[model samples]
Target chain A: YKLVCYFTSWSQYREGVGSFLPDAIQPFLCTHIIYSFANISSDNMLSTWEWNDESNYDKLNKLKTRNTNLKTLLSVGGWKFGGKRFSEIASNTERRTAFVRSVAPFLRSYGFDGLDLAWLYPRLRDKQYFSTLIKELNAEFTKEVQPGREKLLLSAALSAGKVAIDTGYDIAQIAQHLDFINLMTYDFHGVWRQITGHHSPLFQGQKDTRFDRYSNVNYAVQYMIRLGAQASKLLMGIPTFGKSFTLASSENQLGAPISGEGLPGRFTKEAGTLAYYEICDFLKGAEVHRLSNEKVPFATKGNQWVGYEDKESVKNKVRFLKEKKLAGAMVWALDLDDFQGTCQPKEFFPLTNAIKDALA
Target chain B: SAYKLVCYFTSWSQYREGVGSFLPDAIQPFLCTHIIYSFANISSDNMLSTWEWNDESNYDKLNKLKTRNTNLKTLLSVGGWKFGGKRFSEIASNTERRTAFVRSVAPFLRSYGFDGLDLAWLYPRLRDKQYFSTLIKELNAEFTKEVQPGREKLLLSAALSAGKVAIDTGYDIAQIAQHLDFINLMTYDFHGVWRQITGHHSPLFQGQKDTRFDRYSNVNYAVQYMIRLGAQASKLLMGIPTFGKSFTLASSENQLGAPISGEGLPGRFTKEAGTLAYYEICDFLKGAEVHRLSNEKVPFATKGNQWVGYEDKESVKNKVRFLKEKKLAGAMVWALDLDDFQGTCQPKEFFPLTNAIKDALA
Candidate 1:
């Protein structure tokens, strides 16, 4: 099984951890490395930040020399930048051709192996265009191939929720055009919900209602498989971050009443969200609660409750992936894990390392 | 090409109504190219069993409806929610039993004067996912073999749940499509009073921002999903509900998004909570305003705490237009009896919504 790890570029700026340089990435840690958040231009063209992108792309690609087995992909678009930026160019040849042409130069020149379409969504209105984006890109790579060139891996980071799949994806069609699908199976229940719950529960917890039936990793993976996605082509998503919520009262449990956003991270300073590194530091020596019915683990420090997939959860997830016979498992980003040797053991990459050893 | 109008006629409806209220003569043959006798059960032996005391008599009675129109063909539906999966699992598993089930299909159709058999296997489990396809394949083999030289072959059909969960668990869509002549999508039941919230039962789109299940369960997504799964769109029949699912309102907002404590009041005759016949819906809407959801592409009514989501002439016409747009085979009504069959509608409207759907399709 292949281990795909997404390397987030923005996390390099997080304080106290110093800089998470691309060169710091252990190529042997994963089979595939994706450098995230390469912004797509307004005209539907792939554009890197002129100030830092070129330098960052250079550093990311250089990791191949350290470990030749590591294949790097440049992912375009994130949740915020999606909107109409992608749908417009996907419809016509000129625009699609323009979009495709813009990416090809950097791909081979910069030593990147592939491209990841990170549109985050495509509504029912854009279903046709979304299909065309993948189809036309796949077609262009073939039709415009010159001698000695290899086929670049094509993929999309798609929503794992059924709501997103039904409203945004044409699964059968998209499956045909990509090497594999990255299922963003986490963030199932977050601050968006009126209640706080497991962000990436492997199975339905005892407190979960009917709405939560399809909201977990198992259902999402099985669901996509049942929808005709080749089992071997879907990479199960694993989150290295923890989702947090403040307790409305002292009764903090699975379905405990949560008033609003959790307290800001001590280091990360992000409310209602925390990195694995921060979670380890915050919840160190605290009694973590693991529900019997599910593999998800959570802990409450006074009014602060955070649910995250710890090492035990990782073991459960890896077993699940093996059981499902999927392509592999993917972490959201490398830096979010206990990468700074900050937890009780003060280990190097404690959270992500578990997956590395498990997958190995 | 003319669209197929397939309607369901329940054998039990005859018992509920008067002696002649829904007999063979009561059928409007021109209104439907196909009439499916609602249900016959699978006996422990796996052969078709009579559901009611007069099931055999009603079988003969329903066949006579075909005489009223030469183009009309009647079918017998076997299995339903009431059948459960235990017997179906048993019947579809063993080789001998499956063979017996397949072998009896044609003979039973011939004996009952049914043009085909509708396998309404309420649902198939994850394990029976492939097994269900095997049943269809074996049944179709018999159908093809039993086809008379120049006569119409016995049609094989299935009533399927439109929800993603049900589809994934209950079907191998492309495999099912390859063997069956058409798929009847039970596209209703989007929401009801059972949900403890007032919501439309069968909205065309994610009508006015629906639930996760609703978004995926609506006709648009379901049809698109099957089509994406390689089910031939032309062979898929979109289902329309003759009855509306009702919900009791919890608040005076009383709109689609109002919260409720529980299921709506039961129907006087159907006696099912949060359920109503189209006629009951008609009476409930008397002097009550009918509101339309442009996105959902359906209308609903609220009377005090009673709320109903149903299809009227305008909505049925729109649904026919949708069928045309999607290039679906046709539309099918759940049953003939639940509709305002008595013209008990205001201004004494005759064949109200069905005729409107007919004209729309025509």
Candidate 2:
């Protein structure tokens, strides 16, 4: 019964209305807003990435006054932060103790509600360390609480890859300490591959081969539950962005060969990645079609192919979550959706709103 | 350069009346590289023995097949689903009983002119995990010792479980892989009238709605899990069924996950409830509305209140392609009796389903 929205610190760097600041995030849209992300200082303490992060954090936290039930958590580590730093911190007791000691004071000073560890993920060797880190964080958070104030929340953003799940987590142990898990089920197929595919397919497509069968939102959710993660603690990720690729040939089907990333979106300006608003603009002139087996749409305009989520697909995902009886849905970022009602010119935060309404 | 085509010839098939009646003579020598006669029962004394009264003559007719096609080989399979796992567990419960059974195996095979022995214990219990591995090792050692110059050692192979629960609980896969010449994975029977909802008995892949542990029931997960557990892909022969699991639909709503009352009515020939031969399915397909489960890579046909999930040309071909892609030994058919060997149905090609299997692998 929660809609967790991830708001990125860097979305503020985008152009015009696409430049997402605290003002763009409607406090009522999501039950929980996760601010991504903070960094691991060279000295092993929690640190801020953006220069304006302090002022931004205040503005973001002030929204809780308008809606008291809204919870905001700061995520630490991401794809770019890499595992080496987290590995170094968790490699030994002294370093882990130093890192865990920094978490509580940092959150309290910033008026944040909780912490989300997005280690980009831990390797097999780091399994015990990851478990121990979470256990210690949970214990510290519990001990640091005062009379009427609540203890800080602990959660994690996990990988959807089967191999990654097997190696990165001791799911049962981690689930015991964390409040909920944000399973990053999207980005299953992206520019990282030589083929064009949906970045966040709800189900496995027909053309998927070999280990590709193990990828998809449904598989990941099923796998996590099978590996002993509690279903109620699980939150499936729904991407508000799409992955685009430049086709190598006239074959614009799913498994078609890709030469490289697609041309950057005018608003998002990230090659191979497109915001929902940007895709709406792209869809205006593109030949769009939804994959029957997957239920997610992909558009092809000449050699440029993109696989994205729309309001219809988002509702399907919400229905899937409800059917599975999962805790809630987690949107990757608030900025990626059609937040300003600009491209749609009809609705604000269309994808996120669809999820909220569906969950209701 | 051709792959292994292992076909099982059920002894009891000869009991079926008219067109369903099949004997060793019905086997086309060149159709399969290996033909296995199933099954000789384990005696009360814990030794290999015949199940049917005419098995002696049947063995001779089966062994004689090699004369027409010199490349062919036949094996005698002991135990089946009806035989259950307790008997196998009892045989492996102690060293004396194990040795007694082991010593009785080769002599019976040699006496019957079978070139190999196929152990089909239905499944080993969790308690028999180590005992099963030990039994295989002992059987392998005895077979190897019996080898002399110019005389070949009897082949050792087994029919293994495909379900994840059975696999994890009952097998030491690597040990089984090391000692067996061929591992025929029973990758079908994944779903049937045993459950309330309908599902393809041997789905190549999982359906989107299949969640949690239910996802592990497909051929893809079964094969991949075996490989992950250290079974050499070359020693593995992926199983293909020539029969389908049938269900009596509760209502006209016949989608895969719809409710089912019970087993479908017995086939005219096979007479087995909850099951239909491929030929029976071919007839059933004539007027039945057929739909393919794209994710599963198989088809299920519904007629009236009857529902059956079965293999077809496209599915068997897809399985062969999967076998090639995985570099597996090749295909293993459950039984020859289930296919349209009499050319009595549909396209009217003799052994149509089996032919589809062979041609697809080619």
Candidate 3:
């Protein structure tokens, strides 16, 4: 299994543990390192948020020099731009052709060997256009080029839920173009849902399967394969961050109703989302429970309940990927993982390194 | 039942760069069924001989691996590549010389607590064919002959060449297979620096585009060739090379038929031009994308004009699966020392390819 480490650009702003820069990347431990959120300009011509994306890009590609096996890619778009920008860009052939044309030159100029479409989703309205956009984008990477010139890799981060998967995107068509499809298999239940759940259960739990029926990674993967997504190109996206919620009452048993998002993260500073490093420190004496049948682990302390992946869960997911012959496992973002040696005995990249080790 | 996992413990690895000071504790017994201590030697008098059978030499030190691995048998191998290998053609030639070899080797193997002697004659030739069978037959007689009763009989094995040339000239497959416990088929070196054209050293099958003798230079063709020649499939141990054969390309073209200058680079420790350990290859390609040839189940990585065909965890797994499908006795690695035995170049990458073989067979 190849290791694709998705890195959020905003993670550079992470306080306390220092900046997560290009130099900090352990390139040998990863096959492909994606820089998240090249984002969409209002006029929508494959733009970037990083002013020094070019300079930073040069520094990043040099990482390949240190370890020539590392693949660096520029990921365009995050959840920040949704239906409006994506629909506008893909809905028209002129805009679609222009965007695809702009993408390869933009990424290649920066020394990136690929482009990742972080579309978050393609809605039912943008169905054909989504795949058409990917088809064109895939072709640009496969376009005739000089011999020995590096060919770009094309991939897309996809929605994991069955509803969005079935209604929103063209599975076979999108999968046909993309080198890999990163399944956002986590975030199954969070503060927004007002309930606690094992965010990235490898298999479905009795409660959810008996009720919602398709909320876990197993269901999402099975649905995608049934819809004709190639099993070899489906990368199950694991979360290095966790979802936390404050309980409505004393009860905090996984399904316990939540009053609101757990207090802002002490490290990431984002409400509800807690990075693995901080969570390790935050849940020192908390009562952690493993949903064994689901192959996921969760923790609850007082009115605060959290759902996240630790090494044990990650290993199980890796085994699942191997058993099912999935292409690889991708982490949502590297910076959110246990990067700073704070996770007790593990010391560093606890969640991150687990992915690489399990692949081996 | 789990298949036997035989491995050759090359004597010189103690001087290897990162694999220095090899000890019995490093054996990791569960990974091996038999650990053959290589290059014991052959004497001019045709006696089963040892350059160093003294109390403190590696012969004694490596044999103690059996103490740690009770289920394991340490076969003291005689002859290797060019070391004492060519002596076999001389030793097997005459009846007196052949008789002297069997008389001395059988008892000597028993005395050293060595379970067997691996005959690794660099190769056999057409004229040497019948003599090879005579040598094995006399040795097998010593193994089961009544004179050495109550004592456990020693295991008798021989390393055979996979090339059709050797099979045709040096081996009487049916007769040779009859007298040996298992035939260790050295299936690698199908292509090396000696052949200027770049190709996979141990491809599982010939690719669709491949049209030459390269077709027979692969595991599928070689194994079946031996089996068809009357060697029992169950008694054949297919050899997997832990090192890769490399070629310096004539041009930037990285495909198989591209012309080549020579071996890629000299190994750090092995120092063999055109050959590299799996550990060295791992470090060399810390980031170079490896390209796998599907029709030919082997992977080759290219950097500049240097192209190397080696096995990764993926290729290893594929080969092991192929072995299980063939239902052969088991797989044999050329030598255990070439793997990432130390978790340094790649942490936790120690012997993973071999371990994958064990798991696949299990």
- Residues A1-360, model 2: lDDT tens digits: 889999898786554457687767787999999998899787788989764588889989899998898899999998888899899999789888988999999999999999999998899999899999999999999999999889999999999999888897999888989999999989888566798888788888776586578878999999999988888999999999999887776788888998777756766766678898888877876898888888899998756788999889999999998899899999997889998998756788999999999999
State the lDDT of candidate 2 residue by residue for B1-362, as single tens digits. Answer: 46898999798899998889998888878888899999989887879999989999999999888899987889999989788775787788678888999999999998999889998977776667899999999999999999989878899889998888778878999888999999999989887432446788999988886442277889999999999998999899899999999887656789888766556789999999889998888888888999899899999999998999999888999998988999999999987899888888855487777788888778
Clashing residue pairs for model 1 = none
| CAPRI quality of model 2 | incorrect
Question: Tens digits of per-residue lDDT for model 1 on B197-271?
Answer: 567777888765645234685778888998998889888999888888876554576777775534568766566
TM-score-wise, the better of 2 and 3 is 2
Error of 2 at B136 (Å): 0.6
TM-score of 2: 0.50
Where is model 3 more than 4 Å wrong at Cα?
A1-360, B18-25, B52-56, B84-86, B146-150
- For residues A1-360, could you state the per-residue lDDT of candidate 3 as single tens digits? 778888777777767683566666776878898987786665557777877666567667878999987898888878775454776678877877888888877776677888888775665656888888888887778883567687789988888877667656889878888899888988876433336777778777767433257878888888888889998999888898888876656777867765456667776887677888878876887999998778877888877777888888888888888888899988887888877677766466778788888888
Q: Say which candidate scores most in TM-score.
A: 1
Give the lDDT of residue A230 in candidate 1.
Answer: 88
**Please, what are the lDDT tens digits per residue for candidate 1 over residues A235-315?**
999998888887766577788877666656644556677888778766855558997776889877755788888888897
Model 2 chain B: which ten-residue window has the lowest total lDDT?
A: B191-200
lDDT of 2 at B13: 93
After aligning candidate 1 to the native by TM-score, how far in Å is the CA of A19 from where it should be?
A: 47
Candidate 3 has an interface RMSD (Å) of 30.4
* Native contacts matched by each model: 0.00, 0.00, 0.00
Ranked candidates, highest lDDT first: 2, 1, 3
